[PDB]
Amino acid sequence: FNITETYLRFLEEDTEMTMPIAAIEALVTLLRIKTPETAAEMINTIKSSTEELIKSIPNSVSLRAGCDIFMRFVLRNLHLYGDWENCKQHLIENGQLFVSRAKKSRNKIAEIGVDFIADDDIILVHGYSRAVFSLLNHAANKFIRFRCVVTESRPSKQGNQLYTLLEQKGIPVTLIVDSAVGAVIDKVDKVFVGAEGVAESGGIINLVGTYSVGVLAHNARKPFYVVTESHKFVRMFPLSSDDLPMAGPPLDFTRRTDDLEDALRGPTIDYTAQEYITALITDLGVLTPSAVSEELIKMWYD
Amino acid sequence: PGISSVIPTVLEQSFDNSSLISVKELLLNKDLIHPSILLLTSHLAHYKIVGSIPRCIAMLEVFQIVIKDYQTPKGTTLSRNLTSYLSHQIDLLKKARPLSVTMGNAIRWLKQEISLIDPSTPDKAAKKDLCEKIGQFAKEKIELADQLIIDNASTQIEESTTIVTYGSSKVLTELLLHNAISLKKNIKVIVVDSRPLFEGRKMAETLRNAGVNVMYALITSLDTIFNDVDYVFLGAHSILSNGFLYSRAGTAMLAMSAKRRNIPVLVCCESLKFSQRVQLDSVTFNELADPNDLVNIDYENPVERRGNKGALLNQFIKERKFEKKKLAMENKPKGNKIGGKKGSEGESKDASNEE
Amino acid sequence: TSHCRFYENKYPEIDDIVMVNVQQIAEMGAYVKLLEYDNIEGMILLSELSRRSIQKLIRVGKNDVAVVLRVDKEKGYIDLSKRRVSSEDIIKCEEKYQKSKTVHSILRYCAEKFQIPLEELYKTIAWPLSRKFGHAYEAFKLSIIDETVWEGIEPPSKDVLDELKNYISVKIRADVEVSCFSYEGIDAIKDALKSAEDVKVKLVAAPLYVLTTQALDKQKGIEQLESAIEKITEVITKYGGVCNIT
Amino acid sequence: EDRLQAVVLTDSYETRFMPLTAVKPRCLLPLANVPLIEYTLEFLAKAGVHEVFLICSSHANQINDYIENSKWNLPWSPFKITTIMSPEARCTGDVMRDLDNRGIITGDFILVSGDVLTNIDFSKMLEFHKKMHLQDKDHISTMCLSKASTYPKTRTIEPAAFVLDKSTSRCIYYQDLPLPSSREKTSIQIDPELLDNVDEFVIRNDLIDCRIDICTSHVPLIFQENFDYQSLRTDFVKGVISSDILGKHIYAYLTDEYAVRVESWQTYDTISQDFLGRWCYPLVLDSNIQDDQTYSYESRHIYKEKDVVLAQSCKIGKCTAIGSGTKIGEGTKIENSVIGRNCQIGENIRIKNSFIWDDCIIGNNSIIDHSLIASNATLGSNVRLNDGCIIGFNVKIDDNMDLDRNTKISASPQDLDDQTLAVSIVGDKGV
């Protein structure tokens, strides 16, 4: 039946489907065919499927997080010691239900956690997340003094896309190169960031350049913020400054070429330390300091 | 009754709160004490090998031995003077060398056990089950935990490594040994030594006994050793309710150095070492020893040279004091390897309320 | 070498009881080897494992309780449970597991000795022991106490059986320093010989008499040796000499 | 106290180095890309020398040439070099006799056997010698001894068991053993001639040979008198002990610091390693003694001379020294090995614990392990060597060769396998 095919199925749509939620849905669909009553025939197979997915991954992190969350949920489910049928049914229900929940979470975020930008606070946004964009658009909807500063993102010209998205909303914007980012911290009030995943230590797994930005923020004492939908907690520990389980090469020194072929192999994923975060905006309450770790502990009971 | 007063050397002006004095050579004591405790105390007082991890285990073993040897009196019940005996033992230990957090925990556990079984059961049936239970506990919360930690470390280590290490922490020795033997990677071990206890030297010896490529350095020689070298590992004693690293001597400086030169530090700890006691400096409660450790002029421990120094009491206004336990900064260590695989040091008491 | 099932059927049924010797745990549950029903690994879940510290008790090597939930009698998928255990039933399950282990141990030395398949041995054993008597270890114990269970089916091997018996359980060394000062002595010695044997007696020196006492189950040899000593003492008291026993 | 002459026993331990010492003199051979005589000279200077005397017989012309070329030949030197030329092949007794015949011996003369390089200050030793001499009229000669590496195990050629006194520092017995190498004599001997006079008996084995002697005017006369003593350690000291001339004293100086003489091949290697590390306190190559030398110090015990070229991406281990005018390629793994002056190293070469002398070409894709290559001897493509393989003068190891453990190669263009001509013996080619 395949999960990979399902994942492929969504390409041009997205922009509200929280990829991880889609993945979860796919998993649920895979499950509800081959009888979820038996644990011997099913859980192992699910694990195998997840492994296969991991193997097949081009450049994605949150899938693993989603799958482990799903597993945890499943584990939680069969603690009621009632009957196998009803519980199974409930589990089945909880896939589409989970998807439904995401929208509600988003709504909650966009109505409650938008009070940071009010008195014409100039925002420096980097790292594309849907939640942040929703917050922005729904702030425009609410009508508030606000200004935007865009740092140029270059994986495959995503900055331009971001700019275009901003345009279809009505709001003056300017482009800043991430080299002259050190020069402009004066008029810009606060730094906001969209993350790919949140680490066990507390730090942020992100894109082409974030650590430097964080450092700059620290230097300037202008606070650093991360806004994400609360399901990006992966069992991963970046122990050193330049280490992550990455699909791409970690700083590969290419041999002496002549025709200019091997050059664009720069770090497309960067990590920042735990101390840099001032506020983390999530749907499960306004929590930051060591909240992710606590959540993880609660999940693993260790 | 024991022995009181008479302390060698100057008392100094600063850092006066904890015991630093005492019985080194025994003279007149109570005629009821089991000698194994005394022997242990004698060992601990003049020890150069132990470092946080094995001490508690040793204590547990001693307790087990005592239990095995224990015989209930015909008149009084199993717990009547036993508590008094325990108290006396504790007092002796304190006199010799101050109690650790692990030791405190062990004591608490013992107390709990005592409360659990009320005086009604016969002798040979109760202690048979007690000793087994204690053994089981030991197997569970210590050795298995250590194994788990080791395995976690195993997956965490990448390819091509150059590591700087410190301490007589048994876990670290186990780790390094494991790396050397069963992993068969490109591991390089650099050792740092300290003046109060020759821990670094011991570590080096252990490495040699396995057959590892070893560089040997000190606290002073650090500016040239970096000039390729990445990982830094330290041995922790206990983590407090604040989250600060309450460990041995030369760690904090090393950590600071690591922080300065790009690459962060990783520290290992057990899931029982956590404390409810609140302190944020070394001044609060510190392991202070006699200035006899800082007498020998380099090279080796047993040399005894008549060089320049060899007086403390006769010298007018001279304070020669050294500290053993230190409080390292919170933000500097990033990695903590506990019972729950991986986590940050800012968690502090997440396992304390969990028990 | 260790392979094949313990009972008659390959895969277990509903409600029937098993046990695992856990190698590794904590991911989904434990996909570890069984010792009650075949050495082929089955799966327990981390849902019906906690009844009332959870990651410390099991870990590696320790005996842990199992009951068969769901069986897939087609390809090979077995569901196992710890919490379902019928109360004290846990203890019974453990006992059963132990019995199974003992049975396995019994049919390992013989397999290595006579160089014959283990499965065949199991087949030949598990019919008047594992079906009629209850479990097989208890039957074996009964046999060792007083032989009655082995008589049902004819054994292809006797040497193997003997070896097994020995393992379950023997010459015990005894030296009697005979220092007689009697009038008639040779006759007395002969008499002693005629009572003590009815075991293996050898002579090296004139004052020293070497004897090895045969034991049925090790502990029985103390009773015979003492008797022999007594007989010896009786022997020389009437004539007028002495025998020193170390 | 001042004005002391030096006599150096050179060209004595030939054929002991079984492959080499046939065409060129023994002492002229480089230790670490620079001749062994120089170190000795430096040591002598440090001690306090006013005139230099060298004993040459085997290839003396070359030695003379070297002397002429050397720095001490010019008038600025406090000590001048005048060589003793003698007939071929004679023992140290004969040499002593010859010296006596000539007659330059005055006061406390310095006699050094072989070549020694050590860090210990000598003035104090000299003072001690003087003070002890001032005690009693019949005092003979000084011997140098240093504390060994706890337990002896690598010492088989000269594991001398020294029974010593603490009060006077005087030798009681000398004995040589083959005990660790061959289990035939695991043995100890004590003589009773000095039992009821010393009382304080300390039996020791862990002491390393130095063979540096401070000798009085009595010694040559003694040598002249008793012509039976051909050697100076085995027969002489023992004779002295057993009262050849009644009522006489000898010295055995004890020092905690490092002092070892050159004797074999493994020992030589060890000495070199020590030199590379910071074992000797002031003896470092970066100070530049020969004036033509341009050595400089770098991190992790690495020596680099001027005009040394090394290509990018080559992982190095611990303790490496490179001579001037070197060209090294890419993909090399270098560990605990010294490369000579003007050596051309190819590509993809793994080296561990080896030794390379002056002007040697190492071929592409080759592995060298714990083996020595002498001057102007070249290694070809795909050569795999094992522990302790000595290669002689001008030996041309061409394409594709494999040599097993402890294979010795001849130096002169006789009895030992593998020759100086094209290809080492796997297919028979040579004289």
UniProtKB/Swiss-Prot annotation, chain A:
User: Has the keyword Protein biosynthesis been applied to this entry?
Assistant: yes
Q: What happens when the gene is disrupted?
A: Inhibits GCN4 derepression in glucose, amino acid, or purine-starved cells.
What Gene3D superfamilies does this protein map onto? Translation initiation factor eif-2b, domain 2, Translation initiation factor eIF-2B, N-terminal domain
Record-level GO cellular component terms: cytosol; eukaryotic translation initiation factor 2B complex; guanyl-nucleotide exchange factor complex
Can you supply a Gene Ontology BP term from the record?
positive regulation of translational initiation
| Primary residence | cytoplasm
**Listed SUPFAM superfamilies:** NagB/RpiA/CoA transferase-like
One family from Pfam that matches here is IF-2B
Domain of life of the organism in this record?
Answer: Eukaryota
Give residues where Phosphothreonine occurs.
Answer: T288
Give the keywords, sorted.
Acetylation, Activator, Cytoplasm, Initiation factor, Phosphoprotein, Protein biosynthesis, Repressor, Translation regulation
The Swiss-Prot or TrEMBL record annotates one GO molecular function as:
enzyme regulator activity
Annotated localization: Cytoplasm, Cytosol
Subunit field text: Component of the translation initiation factor 2B (eIF2B) complex which is a heterodecamer of two sets of five different subunits: alpha, beta, gamma, delta and epsilon. Subunits alpha, beta and delta comprise a regulatory subcomplex and subunits epsilon and gamma comprise a catalytic subcomplex. Within the complex, the hexameric regulatory complex resides at the center, with the two heterodimeric catalytic subcomplexes bound on opposite sides.
PANTHER family recorded: TRANSLATION INITIATION FACTOR EIF-2B SUBUNIT ALPHA (PTHR45860:SF1)
Family indicated by similarity: Belongs to the eIF-2B alpha/beta/delta subunits family.
> What else is noted?
Present with 8970 molecules/cell in log phase SD medium.
- Its recorded name reads Translation initiation factor eIF2B subunit alpha
Swiss-Prot record, chain B:
| Segments of skewed composition (Basic and acidic residues) | 342-352
Alphabetical GO CC annotations of the entry are: cytosol; eukaryotic translation initiation factor 2B complex; guanyl-nucleotide exchange factor complex
Disulphide bonds in the chain = none
Asked if Phosphoprotein is a keyword of the record, the answer is: yes
**Keyword Protein biosynthesis applies:** yes
What biological process terms from GO does the record include?
cytoplasmic translational initiation; regulation of translational initiation
Disordered as annotated region, ranges: 328-355
**Keywords, sorted A to Z:** Acetylation, Cytoplasm, Initiation factor, Phosphoprotein, Protein biosynthesis, Repressor, Translation regulation
Primary localization: cytoplasm
GO molecular function annotation: enzyme regulator activity; translation initiation factor activity
Compartments, as annotated in UniProt:
Cytoplasm, Cytosol
Write out the similarity annotation: Belongs to the eIF-2B alpha/beta/delta subunits family.
Task performed by this protein: Acts as a component of the translation initiation factor 2B (eIF2B) complex, which catalyzes the exchange of GDP for GTP on the eukaryotic initiation factor 2 (eIF2) complex gamma subunit. Its guanine nucleotide exchange factor activity is repressed when bound to eIF2 complex phosphorylated on the alpha subunit, thereby limiting the amount of methionyl-initiator methionine tRNA available to the ribosome and consequently global translation is repressed.
Query: Note on file?
Result: Present with 10300 molecules/cell in log phase SD medium.
Protein name in UniProt: Translation initiation factor eIF2B subunit delta
Biological source species: Saccharomyces cerevisiae (strain ATCC 204508 / S288c) (Baker's yeast)
The gene coding this protein: GCD2
Span covered, complete protein? 237 to 593 of 651
Swiss-Prot record, chain C:
* Cited SUPFAM superfamilies: eIF-2-alpha, C-terminal domain, eIF2alpha middle domain-like, Nucleic acid-binding proteins
- UniProtKB keywords: Cytoplasm, Initiation factor, Phosphoprotein, Protein biosynthesis, RNA-binding
BP GO terms, sorted: formation of translation preinitiation complex; translational initiation
Gene Ontology cellular-component annotations: cytoplasm; cytoplasmic stress granule; cytosol; eukaryotic 48S preinitiation complex; eukaryotic translation initiation factor 2 complex; multi-eIF complex; ribosome
UniProt-reported outcome of changing V201E: Abolishes binding to the eIF2 complex alpha subunit GCD11. Does not affect its interaction with CDC123
**Job of this protein:** eIF-2 functions in the early steps of protein synthesis by forming a ternary complex with GTP and initiator tRNA. This complex binds to a 40S ribosomal subunit, followed by mRNA binding to form a 43S pre-initiation complex. Junction of the 60S ribosomal subunit to form the 80S initiation complex is preceded by hydrolysis of the GTP bound to eIF-2 and release of an eIF-2-GDP binary complex. In order for eIF-2 to recycle and catalyze another round of initiation, the GDP bound to eIF-2 must exchange with GTP by way of a reaction catalyzed by eIF2B.
Q: From the Swiss-Prot or TrEMBL record, give the protein name.
A: Eukaryotic translation initiation factor 2 subunit alpha
**Lineage, broadest ranks:** Eukaryota, Fungi, Dikarya, Ascomycota, Saccharomycotina
UniProtKB/Swiss-Prot annotation, chain D:
Listed A to Z, the keywords are: Cytoplasm, Initiation factor, Phosphoprotein, Protein biosynthesis, Translation regulation
Q: Where are the transmembrane segments?
A: none
Instruction: Show which residues constitute the signal peptide.
Output: none
GO cellular component labels: cytoplasm; cytosol; eukaryotic translation initiation factor 2B complex; guanyl-nucleotide exchange factor complex
Q: Where in the cell is it found?
A: Cytoplasm, Cytosol
**Further comment found in the protein's record:** Present with 33800 molecules/cell in log phase SD medium.
Assembly: Component of the translation initiation factor 2B (eIF2B) complex which is a heterodecamer of two sets of five different subunits: alpha, beta, gamma, delta and epsilon. Subunits alpha, beta and delta comprise a regulatory subcomplex and subunits epsilon and gamma comprise a catalytic subcomplex. Within the complex, the hexameric regulatory complex resides at the center, with the two heterodimeric catalytic subcomplexes bound on opposite sides.
* UniProt similarity note: Belongs to the eIF-2B gamma/epsilon subunits family.
Its protein name is: Translation initiation factor eIF2B subunit epsilon
Please name the taxonomic classification of the source. Answer: Eukaryota, Fungi, Dikarya, Ascomycota, Saccharomycotina
- Full-sequence portion shown in this chain: 24 to 472 of 712
